[PDB]
Amino acid sequence: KETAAAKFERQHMDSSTSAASSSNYCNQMMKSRNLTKDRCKPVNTFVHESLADVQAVCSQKNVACKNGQTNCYQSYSTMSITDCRETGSSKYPNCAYKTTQANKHIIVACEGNPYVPVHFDASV
Fold this sequence. Notes:
This protein is of the alpha+beta class. The chain is built from three helices and seven strands, in the order H-H-E-H-E-E-E-E-E-E. The strands form two sheets. A four-stranded antiparallel β-sheet has the order 2-3-6-7. It is globular and about 40 Å long. Strand 2 (61-63) and strand 3 (72-74) form a beta hairpin. The longest helix has 9 residues, at 4-12. It has one domain (1-124): CATH 3.10.130.10. It is 18% helix and 33% strand. The PDB classes it as hydrolase.
């Protein structure tokens, strides 16, 4: 099994690029990060910032998670992100994703000691 922290890193961190390179960014990353193995993960965001910067969000603006949890945090500033969302031409095993680049606040849920992101709630 994966730690929640490591699963967040695998699903949501891409510090290697300042932003999505091509329209094929999502198809490549969703596969690469093993998010299309059992099924097409329907929605998933990658954050193009350093891991320290994203971890730092756990000490930023305390907000509610969409399900009502109290351990969500909104980043004070916007971040470079890529939203990956399954499109109409997508059918497992042939997953197809729309790539949408944006610069927005992120909201994550945090847990543990050290207190780190374990869930990507939303972007605003």
